[PDB]
Amino acid sequence: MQSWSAPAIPVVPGRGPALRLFDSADRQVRPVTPGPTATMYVCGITPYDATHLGHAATYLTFDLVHRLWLDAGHTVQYVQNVTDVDDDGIDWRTLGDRETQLFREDMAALRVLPPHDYVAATDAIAEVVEMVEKLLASGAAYIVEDAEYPDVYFRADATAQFGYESGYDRDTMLTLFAERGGDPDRPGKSDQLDALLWRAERPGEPSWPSPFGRGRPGWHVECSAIALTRIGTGLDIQGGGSDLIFPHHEYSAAHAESVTGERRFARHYVHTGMIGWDGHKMSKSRGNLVLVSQLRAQGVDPSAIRLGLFSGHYREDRFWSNEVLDEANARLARWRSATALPEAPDATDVIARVRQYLADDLDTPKALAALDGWCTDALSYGGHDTESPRLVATTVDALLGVDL
Ligand SMILES: [Ca+2]
Ligand SMILES: [Zn+2]
């Protein structure tokens, strides 16, 4: 499926430390040690809702991972999905296709590297059916005892390690399950936390054939199946927003560990903070939705959006504000001024520190502040290095995606 166009990626000479990331499971910062090809599955967007700045912040976070892996010479397999299953006046495809296209233009304008496999959830029905078949034949799944709606459910206890990815207690799991798409009170389930794998065909819903009856795939098995068939057991990073910690990434990992037998679906679970506005979460109800195309219409440099979001650590829940935008504009204007000078101070140390800072769990505040300091040195004192203004500009392009 079509994603978006990639920008030119300049080559930064030299090399920096290997990337280390916070793992949500272990709750600690550990090395990311991929093979020659580095693998990444980030959960995509839902076209039936508005894609806002918090969502963009997530894909920008994994853009840095992608760019840092490219800087270290890895070839990358970036896989991303689109949750076009479940959730009007005009058909659900019409207004749904438009949100996906606007997402492409928002990603392209932000110079986000596109995934190598953009897999719609409707183009992966067979892969899901394959995994459910394996899960049923091993006893990990069952068919609920219902006459008209023989739903297929994944046993919460199919994996001994269930709950390792989120750390949540069972009550917290039950409370989140109800509010994030689960059906803890569906009759016939052996355990409240059992996860739907195949929803039985209901009258009025589109359906797909399968050996266990017609219906639709479950949310978590969609992602589990796409990642398994496109990347396999050697998945370096499972990524997404923090709301996906439970249930989504717990069950999606449990499904895959059940079929493959491996202890860990992904070597790293990497979760981003949310981006709110005025002390409030962003949603269509509150009318506080801060969109990327809204800012672009208002004449906001996309690079300024990146720097605004990078001014905070990717794991911090934080808030967008006009003060944040103003500081990003001032920073962008100052970085552009210094990198335009014909000569500047040597940039070897700051580029080294930037690479170290980004390797240290994507410490973009330290990276931004270190670049601020060199720019201020360049503009206050000058220098005799005729290459460092361009060297810093291309470093900022390749590693941060910012176009000066
Ligand atoms: Ca290199
Ligand atoms: Zn997902």
Author numbering: 1 to 87, 96 to 412
Task: Give excerpts from the publication.
MshC catalyzes the ATP-dependent ligation of 1-O-(2-amino-2-deoxy-α-d-glucopyranosyl)-d-myo-inositol (GlcN-Ins) with l-cysteine (l-Cys) to form l-Cys-GlcN-Ins, the penultimate step in MSH biosynthesis. Mycothiol (MSH), the major cellular thiol in Mycobacterium tuberculosis (Mtb), plays an essential role in the resistance of Mtb to various antibiotics and oxidative stresses. Structurally, MshC is similar to class I aminoacyl-tRNA synthetases (aaRSs), especially to CysRS. We here opted for Ms-MshC to carry out affinity determination as the enzyme highly resembles Mtb-MshC with an overall sequence identity and similarity of 79% and 88%, respectively.
Therefore, a crystal structure of full-length MshC is required for a better understanding of the function of this enzyme and elucidation of the binding mechanism of MshC inhibitors. Here, we determined the crystal structure of the full-length Ms-MshC at 2.4 Å resolution. While the published MshC structure in complex with CSA contains two macromolecules in the asymmetric unit (ASU), all structures solved in this work only possess one macromolecule per ASU despite crystalizing in two different space groups. At the same time, the α-helix containing residues P88–R95 is disordered in our apo structure, while it is fully structured in the CSA-bound structure. Detailed analysis of these two structures showed that CSA binding induces a shift of the T46-H52 loop region towards the active site, whereby the side chain of Y48 is flipped inwards into the binding pocket. This concerted conformational change avoids the steric clash between the side chain of Y48 in the apo structure and the ordered positioning of the P88–R95 containing α-helix upon CSA binding. Additionally, the full-length crystal structures of ligand-free and compound-bound MshC provide the first glimpse of how this sulfonamide scaffold induces a number of conformational changes in the protein upon binding in the catalytic site.
